Amino acid sequence: MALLTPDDLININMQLQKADSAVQEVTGLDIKGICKALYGTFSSSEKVGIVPVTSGNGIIGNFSASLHAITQYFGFDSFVTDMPDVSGYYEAVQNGAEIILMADDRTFLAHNLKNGKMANNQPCTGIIYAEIASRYLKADSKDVLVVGLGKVGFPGAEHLVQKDFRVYGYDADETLLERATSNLGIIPFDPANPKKFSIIFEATPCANTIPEAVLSENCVLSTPGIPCAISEELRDKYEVQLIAEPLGIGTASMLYSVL
């Protein structure tokens, strides 16, 4: 359970702006374009009701405001209800929400009431970050290092296998590693035997999980993980093309997936 903190979400508009430019640089597409490639969809001011939730750890400072900003950025007609929980859900439906957006400590979801489609943040995030990684314009081959094979990492790796990549997976939990190798057919990556990658997808809640031996100049590191998977020093040394943003890209993936 690695939950966002209010500090992760400070100046979310700038974080999203910067992530969008990096995505354009790496892939030639903006985030909307990535979403169009994945799902074939575009926004048309659909009304999105964002419902604060007091369950578990409770309301996270900046969370709903951040979803508010994220959804406006992508062209949705969004709003945040005054009431939380079930009273908030009611308020949202009654005020004409077409899509509901809400999270407890275990599930962040988007539910499109017009067409019944529903998205879970975890696979949506893994998929979009892996898609971004896969579209690095100047990569020499379909070879990608995946570090972290949990709720985000595994569907990301699955997506890459489906796009005919050689996927090299590592997870510190050896049982997760085994399951993923047998279910997905990924290559089990041994850090003691390192190679350089130009494409890396990382989804862990830990810092400095990408060692120097695995980097090449201008390599792409596409990572929803928090805190950052690579030190500032290694990032500067190898001119890493970092795609890393705390909420928006995954939220976009959810929303465009239910359109």
Ligand X SMILES: NC(=O)C1=CN([C@@H]2O[C@H](COP(=O)(O)OP(=O)(O)OC[C@H]3O[C@@H](n4cnc5c(N)ncnc54)[C@H](O)[C@@H]3O)[C@@H](O)[C@H]2O)C=CC1
Ligand Y SMILES: C[C@@H]1CC=N[C@H]1C(=O)NCCCC[C@H](N)C(=O)O
Interface positions with ligand X (CB under 6 A): 2, 121-122, 125, 147-153, 170-173, 176, 203-206, 209, 224-226, 245-247, 249-250
Identify what 167 binds: ligand Y, Mg ion, Na ion, none; CB under 5 to 8 Å per kind: none
Which span (26-34, 49-57, 75-83, 163-171) binds ligand Y, by CB under 6 A? 49-57
> What sign results for the dihedral spanned by CA atoms 53, 120, 98, 70?
positive
Pick the binder of ligand Y from 76, 89, 108, 165 (CB under 6 A): 108
Q: Which residue is nearest to ligand X (CB)?
A: 150
Supply angle C-alpha 61, 62, 66, rounded to 5: 155
Which span (19-27, 88-96, 100-108, 188-196) binds ligand Y, by CB under 6 A? 100-108
Q: Is 196 helix (H, G, I), strand (E, B) or coil?
A: coil
Least Å distance, CB 27 to Na ion, is 21
For ligand Y, which is the closer residue by CB, 169 or 246? 246
User: If binding is defined by CB under 5 A, does position 34 make contact with Mg ion?
Assistant: no
Contact predicate 103/70, CB 8 Å: no
Binding site listing? 4, 53, 60, 103, 151-152, 171, 206, 224, 226, 245
DSSP letter for each residue of 96-133: T-SEEEEE-SS-EEEEETTT--EEEHHHHHHHHHHHHH
Binding mask 205-244 for Na ion (x = CB under 5 A): --------------------x---x---------------
For residues 168 and 187, give the distance between their C-alpha atoms in angstroms, rounded to a whole number: 5
User: If binding is defined by CB under 5 A, does position 204 make contact with Na ion?
Assistant: yes
CB atoms within 10 A of CB 86: 10
CB atoms within 10 A of CB 16: 23
For Na ion, which is the closer residue by CB, 128 or 258? 128
Binding site listing for NAD(+)? 151-152, 171, 206, 224, 226, 245
Pick the binder of ligand Y from 9, 26, 48, 64 (CB under 6 A): 64
For residues 79 and 118, give the distance between their C-alpha atoms in angstroms, rounded to a whole number: 19
Identify whether 211 is preceded by a cis peptide bond (ω within 30 of 0).
no
- Encode burial over 218-232: b for 16+ CB neighbours within 10 A, e otherwise: ebbbbbbbbebbbee
For residues 165 and 159, give the distance between their C-alpha atoms in angstroms, rounded to a whole number: 9
Identify what 15 binds: ligand X, Mg ion, Na ion, none; CB under 5 to 8 Å per kind: none
Task: Kindly list the residues in this chain that would bind ligand Y in the complex (CB under 6 A).
Answer: 3-4, 52-53, 55, 59-60, 63-64, 103-105, 108, 121, 247
Task: Kindly list the residues in this chain that would bind Mg ion in the complex (CB under 5 A).
Answer: 245, 249-250
